[PDB]
Write a protein that holds these residues in place. Structure first.
Motif, mmCIF file in Angstrom:
data_model
loop_
_atom_site.group_PDB
_atom_site.id
_atom_site.type_symbol
_atom_site.label_atom_id
_atom_site.label_comp_id
_atom_site.label_asym_id
_atom_site.label_seq_id
_atom_site.Cartn_x
_atom_site.Cartn_y
_atom_site.Cartn_z
ATOM 1 N N UNK A 7 0.823 -1.204 0.000
ATOM 2 C CA UNK A 7 0.000 0.000 0.000
ATOM 3 C C UNK A 7 0.862 1.260 0.000
ATOM 4 N N UNK A 8 0.233 2.420 -0.149
ATOM 5 C CA UNK A 8 0.954 3.681 -0.113
ATOM 6 C C UNK A 8 1.678 3.857 1.237
ATOM 7 N N UNK A 9 2.815 4.533 1.192
ATOM 8 C CA UNK A 9 3.554 4.854 2.406
ATOM 9 C C UNK A 9 2.889 5.943 3.237
ATOM 10 N N UNK A 10 3.491 6.245 4.389
ATOM 11 C CA UNK A 10 2.997 7.321 5.253
ATOM 12 C C UNK A 10 3.290 8.690 4.649
ATOM 13 N N UNK A 11 2.632 9.706 5.207
ATOM 14 C CA UNK A 11 2.805 11.083 4.770
ATOM 15 C C UNK A 11 4.187 11.585 5.087
ATOM 16 N N UNK A 12 7.436 14.502 5.196
ATOM 17 C CA UNK A 12 7.817 15.534 6.158
ATOM 18 C C UNK A 12 7.385 16.921 5.739
ATOM 19 N N UNK A 13 7.601 17.889 6.626
ATOM 20 C CA UNK A 13 7.150 19.241 6.362
ATOM 21 C C UNK A 13 7.963 19.938 5.274
ATOM 22 N N UNK A 14 7.315 20.871 4.600
ATOM 23 C CA UNK A 14 8.032 21.753 3.716
ATOM 24 C C UNK A 14 8.901 22.761 4.427
ATOM 25 N N UNK A 15 9.622 23.572 3.651
ATOM 26 C CA UNK A 15 10.500 24.585 4.230
ATOM 27 C C UNK A 15 9.730 25.812 4.679
ATOM 28 N N UNK A 16 10.369 26.664 5.461
ATOM 29 C CA UNK A 16 9.709 27.867 5.916
ATOM 30 C C UNK A 16 9.283 28.775 4.764
ATOM 31 N N UNK A 17 8.244 29.551 4.962
ATOM 32 C CA UNK A 17 7.889 30.588 4.029
ATOM 33 C C UNK A 17 8.895 31.714 3.977
ATOM 34 N N UNK A 18 8.738 32.619 3.008
ATOM 35 C CA UNK A 18 9.616 33.792 2.936
ATOM 36 C C UNK A 18 9.263 34.822 4.015
ATOM 37 N N UNK A 19 10.104 35.819 4.167
ATOM 38 C CA UNK A 19 9.804 36.949 5.045
ATOM 39 C C UNK A 19 8.446 37.608 4.734
ATOM 40 N N UNK A 20 7.727 38.061 5.755
ATOM 41 C CA UNK A 20 6.455 38.727 5.545
ATOM 42 C C UNK A 20 6.507 40.043 4.808
ATOM 43 N N UNK A 21 5.326 40.657 4.588
ATOM 44 C CA UNK A 21 5.250 41.915 3.834
ATOM 45 C C UNK A 21 6.088 43.006 4.497
#
Lengths: 23, 23, 23
Positions: A7-11, A12-21
């Protein structure tokens, strides 16, 4: 005899977003 | 009759996070 | 024998970015 694929494997996180406005 | 099912697949990274807080 | 492995699992979004620069 051969068995079916597993069956399909388990679901890591992506990288941080950029600096805010700019202030 | 068939062999047993295979193991679970490998665990990819998520999308980028959102932009940070307003400056 | 046991079957081959399954496919890769699902891809969380990353954390919020740092604060925007002050102005």
């Amino acid at each position: 005899p051969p068995g079916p694929p597993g069956p399909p494997g388990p679901r890591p996180p992506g990288p941080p977003g950029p600096p805010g406005p700019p202030g």
